[PDB]
């Protein structure tokens, strides 16, 4: 559809007396099908820039045929897709008017700019801005992450109406549908209430909020932490979210990747030493485990899991808390370095760990904190009792599983004593 | 019960062997201000064939201290490195990384079996 | 100065003893590894680096063999001197219309900095010079068995700054390999040589940098580096007479019969050479 | 600045009786070891702070032989002064940007400091110094069998603060090696020594701190520790005419007739020094 749903909504809004605007060879245009209208040679211009989509040039478009390649049948220019001329300049006028910031219709999203709305008037118009970029709007999510009807915290909503998204992405003066997606507004609330759902893990602070940020959580995937950098094709993927369907099998990889990358960066002047294994990654490794392998992962650390990968995970975060307690100021740690060996290779470097480990509680058994010397060795004692080897080798699956059990035992860690 | 003392793996064997030591130096001198884990862990995984003759006699003095008082348990902890080391041959020169892993999990699995009530 | 005339490629073996071969930006300092096997790695960048540096050294800026990738140099003003040469005069970010005044800038810029005739490089910033392949190529190598990178802890007597930490001593770290044999294999193109100008002289040049290649690199991180075989197989013609992974496969690393216990040194392993195809010959006394 | 002309290669042979030659500062104060194979580690830094320590002994602060390093000595205050010798103002972080300016001041710290005209310095700081890379390098060094060291429970009949009891008052500990043989590695680059100005007479110096390194170094924790070899390989040319590797093999060091037992005094050992290459000359006199 998307041209022609461009094409109803000038329709719709162009009604208006207000928020909108009235303004206006022979063949059959593809958005409408009649036949026997005046073809257009060139389609008036789209907005790029802050106006725009960010990223493109001031005068991008959608239909553009500048070069031979990309000419068919002997037809010249915009005569490759012919479209009346009202109708194309009834869907450049809505989508100039969905990328207009001041209406409140528009979000971007790392590479690609998005823009929504629906087939009548409805509040979801304004809501959506909400849901996929988080700041009554806590209380919607809440609700809609515990599968309640929308109506329930406004029952003025009709769930029934279609709701359109369209994301596109920028080029030399000519921009790219990324995703398209429509359907009623009830269901895609109910498909963010499921991502929601599955990214669900508890905060590692209190600062943190409870629904991130797509952009957030992308953004924690990038080289360096910035919004450039980000995969432009994991965030068009990461459509995943309000389709409902599989996150790309490229995410896991990507979080592991930057997991692995990343070391606590004091350089942010950040007193507390940043964590690799941030709550946005694990809520993201969170969400891909519970979508794509169907398997069971809790929002809080389990003492009674016994999955070798989440006890793995456990160990190595209480050996970092012993590390942590030994060596105060310490500049780095076994997570800065040894994280991602130990996740992908357990039989080849837990010994070394557990050696240091065994220094660093016995430098404590001698200084004060001669007990929680003895704490930290009765917790290595029962996570190891459920172990019977080290695995040589664990898949990319359970190195996820490991993470989240780093994550879990870390955070239970931080004010037990 | 998590130990297995059918497993038999020299690593294995090795570490229940340590954690038996270890339980019976800290038996045998409470509120010693190291336990031999501490003094002798990285030798001990390091260079096994030089080290457990001497782990092995400082726990034939700690089992004969025990011996000495109704507190005596030194009968258990003897029966046990006698079983243990009977299904040694002889000891490694060097261990392997996931050798030297497999080791710590035994010492690790020894020793809350001697835990237990 | 013609080009070589034959394909080659070779296979490098080198060692290190406690040392750090080629520290990893994100991992710390630690030596890089392969995180799923424990297998070391170095990169080509690395013992490009090394080469080059071997270069400057034994050649000492002569005419002909400058290092375009130096310790303080900026590419521009080096890429001004091209078309300063050449009379030339840039474009603010492309080459000159007249192709061939553009490779007269590229032949300038090949001409007389080795590295550039080389391994290439990618001169197309705002002084625009174009780009290079380089006829010599290296892979990353890596180490024929996974490598324990042990930690080790150091203390400083001195402060740098006003403070009052020394209570205890400044505190810092090293990361060594303990030991490590590693493989790195090579190619260099004849068609490419054409087409840079990579002579004979070069290739003496490049074997003779390889074979000593570490014996100047000594630093407080590095240890002891050697180069310990390295294994040339020269075709009898422009393009290869047989494919190179299966030259690669004649040079076989397996550790000796009577070595047991982590490997410690290079006599722990043993390296065999098979018997060449019938087009290629194996320069092994290198 | 008449700087050394020939490449050099040494070997140093050093025991230890009853005593902790260097402590590991994240395991307690335990000797180091190989986590592998048991064989005892002296890093390179502790013997070079034993020759900065000889040479500060036996020259007194003589003019172009002060220590850099020192003891609980602020860096950045040393920096200032070549900064003021030369009559330039250090930048916050920065170099002078001339680049002869830039380098006075680095000469200024190479000829004034023999540490760091000798193993080099890192002075990128808030006043800025440059790096200089050392010409002479040593690598760690490791002991020919493996050693077993031995904590040993010492008690001290006073008390602190307030005891506890107020039976026992104080448990201390000493760690030891019973005995261990440490072979060192060391290098002398003569390209670094012409950019540092390290001289023949630095040299001597520097053979005069490795024989009496350990002469007065001696302390509670150190025991007994000696030098009992020093091969010295000096190549006939700048750049050297022979792998440093081969030139280190030709040391060997085997068990005696006496191979009865653990090995206890450097009588255990017999070592033994082969012929050097054409263009390589061996003095082992030292």
Not at chain 1, 395 to 401: A, H, K, R, Y
Not at chain 2, 1 to 18: C, E, I, N, Q
Not at chain 2, 66 to 75: G, Q, T
Not at chain 3, 95 to 100: I, R
Request: charged content about 25%; some cysteine; glycine content about 6%.
């Amino acid at each position: 559809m998307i041209l022609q749903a461009l094409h109803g909504y000038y329709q719709r809004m162009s009604a208006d007396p207000d928020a909108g605007m009235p303004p206006y060879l022979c063949g059959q245009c593809l958005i409408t099908g009649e036949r026997q209208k005046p073809i257009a040679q060139l389609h008036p211009s789209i907005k790029g820039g802050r106006d725009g989509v960010r990223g493109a040039q001031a005068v991008a478009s959608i239909v553009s045929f500048n070069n031979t390649a990309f000419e068919s049948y002997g037809k010249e220019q915009s005569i490759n897709a012919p479209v009346s001329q009202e109708a194309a300049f009834s869907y450049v006028t809505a989508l100039n008017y969905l990328l207009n910031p001041s209406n409140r219709q528009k979000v971007t999203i790392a590479d690609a700019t998005v823009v929504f709305w629906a087939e009548r008037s409805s509040p979801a118009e304004d809501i959506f801005a909400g849901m996929f970029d988080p700041p009554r709007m806590h209380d919607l999510l809440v609700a809609i992450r515990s599968g309640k009807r929308a109506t329930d915290i406004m029952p003025d909503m009709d769930e029934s109406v279609r709701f359109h998204v369209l994301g596109l992405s920028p080029n030399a003066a000519r921009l790219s549908v990324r995703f398209w997606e429509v359907d009623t507004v009830g269901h895609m609330l109910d498909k963010v209430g499921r991502h929601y759902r599955e990214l669900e893990i508890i905060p590692q602070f209190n600062n943190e909020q409870e629904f991130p940020s797509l952009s957030t959580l992308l953004r924690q995937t990038a080289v360096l932490n910035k919004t450039e950098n980000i995969s432009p094709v994991l965030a068009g993927g990461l459509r995943a979210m309000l389709t409902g369907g599989p996150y790309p099998q490229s995410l896991l990889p990507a979080v592991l990747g930057r997991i692995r990358a990343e070391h606590a960066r004091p350089e942010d002047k950040s007193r507390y030493r940043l964590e690799v294994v941030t709550y946005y990654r694990a809520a993201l490794i969170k969400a891909y485990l519970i979508r794509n392998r169907k398997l069971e992962v809790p929002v809080s650390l389990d003492p009674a899991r016994t999955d070798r990968p989440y006890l793995l995970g456990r160990l190595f975060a209480v050996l970092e808390k012993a590390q942590e307690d030994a060596v105060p100021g310490a500049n780095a740690t076994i997570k800065d370095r040894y994280l991602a060996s130990a996740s992908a290779n357990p039989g080849q470097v837990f010994h070394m760990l557990l050696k240091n480990a065994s220094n660093h509680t016995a430098k404590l058994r001698k200084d004060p904190e001669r007990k929680s010397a003895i704490h930290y060795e009765i917790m290595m004692q029962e996570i190891i009792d459920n172990i019977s080897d080290f695995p040589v080798t664990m898949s990319s699956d359970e190195q996820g599983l490991f993470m989240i059990g780093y994550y879990h035992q870390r955070k239970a860690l931080f004010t037990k004593k | 019960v998590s130990l297995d003392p059918a497993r038999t793996d020299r690593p294995y064997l090795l570490g229940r062997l340590f954690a038996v030591l270890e339980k019976a130096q800290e038996d045998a001198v409470p509120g010693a201000n190291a336990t031999i884990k501490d003094r002798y862990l990285a030798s001990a995984s390091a260079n096994p064939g030089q080290v457990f003759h001497m782990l092995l006699k400082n726990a034939s003095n700690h089992t004969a201290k025990l011996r000495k008082d109704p507190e005596r348990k030194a009968i258990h902890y003897e029966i046990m490195m006698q079983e243990i080391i009977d299904n040694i041959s002889d000891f490694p020169v060097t261990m392997s990384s996931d050798e030297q892993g497999l080791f710590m999990i035994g010492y690790y699995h020894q020793r809350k079996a001697l835990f237990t009530k | 100065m013609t080009a070589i005339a034959n394909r080659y490629e070779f296979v490098l073996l080198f060692d290190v003893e406690n040392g750090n071969p080629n520290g990893d930006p994100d991992a710390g300092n630690m030596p890089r590894i392969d995180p799923e096997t424990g297998h070391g790695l170095v990169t080509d960048v690395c013992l490009k680096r090394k080469i080059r540096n071997h270069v400057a050294l034994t050649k000492e800026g002569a005419e002909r063999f400058n290092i375009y990738i130096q310790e303080k140099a900026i590419l521009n003003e080096t890429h001004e001197r091209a078309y300063t040469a050449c009379d030339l005069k840039p474009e603010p970010k492309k080459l000159p219309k007249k192709v061939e005044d553009a490779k007269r800038v590229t032949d300038w810029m090949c001409t007389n900095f080795y590295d550039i005739r080389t391994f290439g490089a990618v001169m197309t910033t705002e002084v625009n010079c174009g780009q290079v392949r380089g006829p010599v190529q290296m892979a990353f190598a890596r180490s024929v068995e996974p490598v324990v990178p042990q930690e080790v802890s150091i203390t400083r007597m001195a402060v740098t700054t006003k403070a009052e930490a020394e209570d205890n001593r400044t505190m810092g770290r090293k990361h060594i390999v303990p030991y490590g044999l590693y493989v790195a294999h090579g190619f260099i193109s004849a068609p490419l040589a054409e087409k840079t100008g990579f002579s004979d002289e070069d290739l003496t040049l490049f074997w003779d940098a390889l074979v000593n290649m570490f014996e100047h690199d000594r630093s407080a991180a590095r240890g002891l580096m050697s180069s310990r075989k390295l294994i040339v197989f020269k075709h009898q013609n422009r393009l290869g007479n047989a494919p190179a992974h299966k030259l690669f496969d004649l040079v076989k690393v397996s550790r000796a019969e009577g070595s047991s216990g982590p490997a410690r040194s290079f006599a722990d392993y043993a390296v065999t050479v098979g018997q060449a195809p019938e087009g290629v010959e194996v320069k092994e006394m290198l």
